[model samples]
Target: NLKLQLKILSFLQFCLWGSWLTTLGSYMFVTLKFDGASIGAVYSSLGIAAVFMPALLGIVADKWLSAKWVYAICHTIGAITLFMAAQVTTPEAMFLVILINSFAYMPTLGLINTISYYRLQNAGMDIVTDFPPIRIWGTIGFIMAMWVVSLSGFELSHMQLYIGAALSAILVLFTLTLPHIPVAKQQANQSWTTLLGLDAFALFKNKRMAIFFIFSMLLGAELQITNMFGNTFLHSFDKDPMFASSFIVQHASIIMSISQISETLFILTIPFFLSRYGIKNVMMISIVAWILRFALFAYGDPTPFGTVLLVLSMIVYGCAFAFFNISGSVFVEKEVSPAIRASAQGMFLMMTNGFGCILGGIVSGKVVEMYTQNGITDWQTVWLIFAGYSVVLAFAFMAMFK
Candidate 1:
């Protein structure tokens, strides 16, 4: 029953995101008619929210509220913003709507993970072995949401937002039934240090953790680039008569779903890889995978052989994501004190999804905008530039991180 409940939490946690994440870029470009820079800025709302929400809310969960209740309330509010976003037509309006939506939704990620860890321990399960398998269900939920959006013909439509809002509503009720988490222990005469969650900040003083976080920011940017461009990149190929009817282009979301599918496969392998190679080496492998992920997209096409690169890019995404993101989260779980675990997890996400996304949105937006010549984007150059950035970061990470 505990496993069943955790699986449900993991599933809904990501289903809300998968409903709109990969296809939002296409919606803004194809339907809303937003410029590259504008859409990029709009997506940055997620980062802007991530930069502060998780930590702030983590503190709330740790000191003042139950993580489960915070998770429920956030999703309840998220449902309202998501539904409202579907009603907006202009980029500026949509940005504000999404910003509100992001603020309500991003912190739930850390909340769900905290709740899961706490419950799994209460159920007497080993986190290292059990959590990854259960987390795979989240990937399944993401894939399921993408297919729903694609098959229902909502991938490029505002209906995707409605779908996400509905799921968020369901999760609000569902989380209430989850195992109740007690708020963190507070001393009767608490000093400011513990009250403020200042211990989470101390992680930066350690050289190993400091560099790990800096590198996480670099790799986190890579995640945002792929999600932002991968679908739109395929959608761009629809203009060519020769490839207009290709499977990949016709069902871009379903094809991109392959990345999440690959993620589930690779996530199951995390315990083994982390134990065998260690987190540093596992992260190094992810960096190399990023290099290949961008390079393949740079040279891939709709033809049989060309499609192979696209498929390969999807496969490597599993490695890139699971190796770095999931492994990194587990690393944090192992490293931090139980008292600060939730906040430390929040910090990990703050660096990767928060600060990293801000960097990716602005820098990659400029790169894409710069490579565009009078409405035609030079996707090849844009992808190659990202690949080059990955290479430099990989070498620097190997030298500095150990």
Candidate 2:
């Protein structure tokens, strides 16, 4: 029952993300006709909020509220702002609403992991092996949400926002049924270092962790690149006469859902690889996978052979994402004591999603906009630029780590 509850929570957690993360780009570009720069700025809200909110809320949950309540309350308020966002047609209004929603939503990414770790440990389970199988359900849930939005014909409409909002409410109610996690008890009189969570900062003093986290931020840029532009790039194909009726373009969300499907498959392999090769090699593989992921997208198309490359791109996404994100989380869990684990997880999320996302959105946005002339984007150049960025990061990581 405990594992089952955590599994369900994991499922709902990512379902909320999948509902709009990929499709929102299409809605902004196709329906609202927002410019690339504007859409990028707006999407940057996820990063902007993630930058501070996750750590701040992590502190709140660790020191004040129970992790479960923090998860529940954030989702409740996030649901309302998500709903409000659907009514805004202007980019400015949508950005404001999404910023409000992001504040409530982004922190939950770390919170869910904290709750799962706490609950699973309480039940005396092997988290390294057990957590991935359960977490795979979250990827499945993400794929399910993508299919739900795609099949229901809501992918390119504001209705996707509504679907996400509704799920947020359902998750809040469901969270109430979860096993309660108590707040961390502290001494009444303590030094400022302990009181202000300066202890968690000690993680940076370790050379290995410092190197790993820096690369984590770099790899995180790969995660958002596909999310921010995958659908828009597909929609761009409609402009070409030969590909106007292609199934890939019309069902882009469903095709993009392949990445989440691949995520589920790769997540299961994390424990084995982490055990056999250790975190460094597994993470090295992830960087190579990241390099290939963008390179494939650079040349793939709807043509018979080209489509194969596209599918391969999606397949590689699982390795690129699962190895780094999940493995990094597990590595952190292993390295840190239980006392400061939540804050450490928050720090991890902050670097990857926060700093990484800001780079992907704002910088990549400018890159894409620069390649676009008179509304015709040089997509090949744009993708290769991203591929090159990954290549450089991989080499830097190879030299810096180990």
Candidate 3:
């Protein structure tokens, strides 16, 4: 029963993430003429936050505060920062706004895992089979957020931020009701500072892991491109009066979010794809999907032809996201030391959500700025360049990681 509640709680946690994640780029592009490069810098804020803040806070909780107390505090902080982000209409104030909000919002990602993981441990359930199904709800919640944001026109409003803030606040309230998870105690023998570096960074000593992490960081860079551009590509329609009524203009993000919806469906497909093709093929399939994701965005418009491409891009996202993230985790589990698995996961987060996201956002944004001009941004040129880049990365990795 407690496990059931935790599942629902996990669902809510990611809904808060979905409320703002993809469509926020559309909001920035449609409302403000911020250059893609600047947008990338803005997008990288989450990556920047992932580098240190969440881990530092996690340590604080593990060593000092009760898990529940720390969880509540983090959620409350995230809510305020998100609400604050809703107010800043201009782009220049971004550096500070994103930094603060990301720091506040980020720990929730890990906290949900902590809450769920602990509950699983208490239940004596096998994590692999049970957890994935429970976690699929997070993707469902993301789909729900995208649809509501698209329908209500809150995709461009402070209302989305308010929704996220509200959910996070409720997350705090709900957290209090959860079964008590014990505060982690520092073992009597260990020094606090000594604990930080010994395990997390030690994974790098192994050659295969070093290569895997480096690959993860590189692949992670591509993850944010759609999040940064899909809505812009869809909404770019309104710039031409011809596209004003087009579904792409109004609902690209919503449609693209179909991938998240498809992902829940495709969870079954992974077993088939990997079993038939093996990990190399499964991972390669995602790289091909990434290439498709970029190429489609470059060519796809509001027309039926364009719309089909748009849908295809969304379809490929399931391959790109699921195959990359999940398979990456499985690879780590297979290759890395058990003691280092947690650290490797953290390192994985660092590569993708941290450095990879930052690199993807900034480089893609810069590509947008370098190629695009006038009051009108040349979004197609920006996307094609990204396609070319992904192609290079895919070819490189195929020869390397495979």
Candidate 4:
């Protein structure tokens, strides 16, 4: 029953994000007519929020408030901000609203993991085996949201934000129904560092954890690259008469939903991989999967043959994302003490979603600009450059991590 509740929580948690995360770039680009840098800046709001809010809020959850209440309150603010985001017309206004929403929403990402792990542990369920099954519902929810937006013709409209806002409001109510996780007690004579939850930073003192977190940040940069541009890439086909009427062009979000669908399968595989291959090998596979994901996108087009490459890229996204994200979370859970559970999870998010996203958003936007000429982007070059970055990262990680 707890698993069922957590499953519902996972589903709704991602459903809110899925409503806009993948399609926002297309809306900003085609409907809002915002430029690349501005779009990237808007996306970077997640990075800015993740940089501090997760850790700060994790401390709140760890030392002061119940995580369920923190989760509910964040969604309350997020719902309001998402509603405001839909009303913004200018890029600056859009960025500001989204940044506020990001502050309210990003911390919830880690909180869900912390809450689920806490509940599962209390229930005497095996987290490595149990959490993935629960998390798979999240990918299903994401795919469902993408389909709804795509089918409703809201992929390029502000309605996507409204959908996300509604979901956020619903999640707030549902979060209140979940069991509470009590805050850790304040210890006497605690240092300022421990009091501030900077104690999670102690993970860096362990060489393996230090390496793991660093690579998590680097790979985190790769996580959003596709979400930010995949639909735009498909929509670009509209300019070409050959693909102007293609199903892929008209229903880019549905096509991109394949990535999330693939996630469900890979999430199911995480326990096996983590147990058999270990984290290092599993992460290596993830890096390789990222290489294939980008390289396929680099060469893919809308032609019958080319569409196959595109589809393959979407399939590979599952392995690239789940192997790193789920495994990394489990790794941190196993490594850290229960006293710092939320704080450590927040630290992981801070590294990956925070620093990684900021670096990825800005650099990828610059790369897109560099390859644009006469108002047409050379997507092939853009993707290849990203893939090349992964290649370098893979080698460096392999050499250093052991």
Clashes of each: 0, 0, 2, 0
The stretch of ten residues in a row with the least summed lDDT in candidate 1 is 187-196
Least accurate stretch of 10 residues (summed lDDT) in model 3? 188-197
Off by over 4 Å in 1: 1-5, 114-134, 176-212, 326-348
Scored by CA lDDT, what does every candidate get? Answer: 0.84, 0.83, 0.77, 0.85
Q: Which stretches of candidate 3 lie over 4 Å from their true place?
A: 1-4, 120-130, 186-209, 336-342
* Top TM-score model: 3
CA lDDT, candidate 2, residue 199? 69
Which of 1 and 2 is ahead in lDDT?
A: 1
Q: In order, what is each prediction's RMSD in angstroms?
A: 3.3, 3.5, 2.7, 3.6
TM-score of each: 0.87, 0.85, 0.90, 0.85
lDDT of 2 by residue, 348-401 (tens): 877787888887787787887788787767778888988898899889888976
If both were scored by lDDT, which would come out higher, candidate 1 or candidate 4?
A: 4
Per-residue lDDT tens digits for candidate 4, residues 1-402, read 788889989999999999999899889888887767778888989899878787678777877888888988899999998899899999899889999999988889879988998899888788889987898888778889999999999999999999999998888888888876877444435665764457778768878778878888888987888999889888877779989878899999988988978877887788898999987788788998999999999988889889999999999999998898877787788777788776677678778878899988877877776776665678888899999999998998889667
Model 2 regions more than 4 Å off: 1-7, 113-134, 177-181, 184-215, 275-278, 326-349
Q: With candidate 3 superimposed using the best TM-score fit, by how many Å does residue 259's alpha carbon deviate from the native?
A: 2.2
Model 2 TM-score? 0.85
What's the lDDT for residue 104 in model 4? 89
lDDT of 2 at 376: 67
lDDT of 1 by residue, 1-402 (tens): 888889988888889889999899888877787667777888889999988777678778877889988888899989998899889899889889889888988888778888988888877788888998788888888999989898888877999999999999988888878766999654436555654445667878877778778888877977878888788888788779998888788778888888888877787788899889887788888899999999999998988988999999999999998788877887787777777776576678778988899888877767777876676677888889999999998889878755
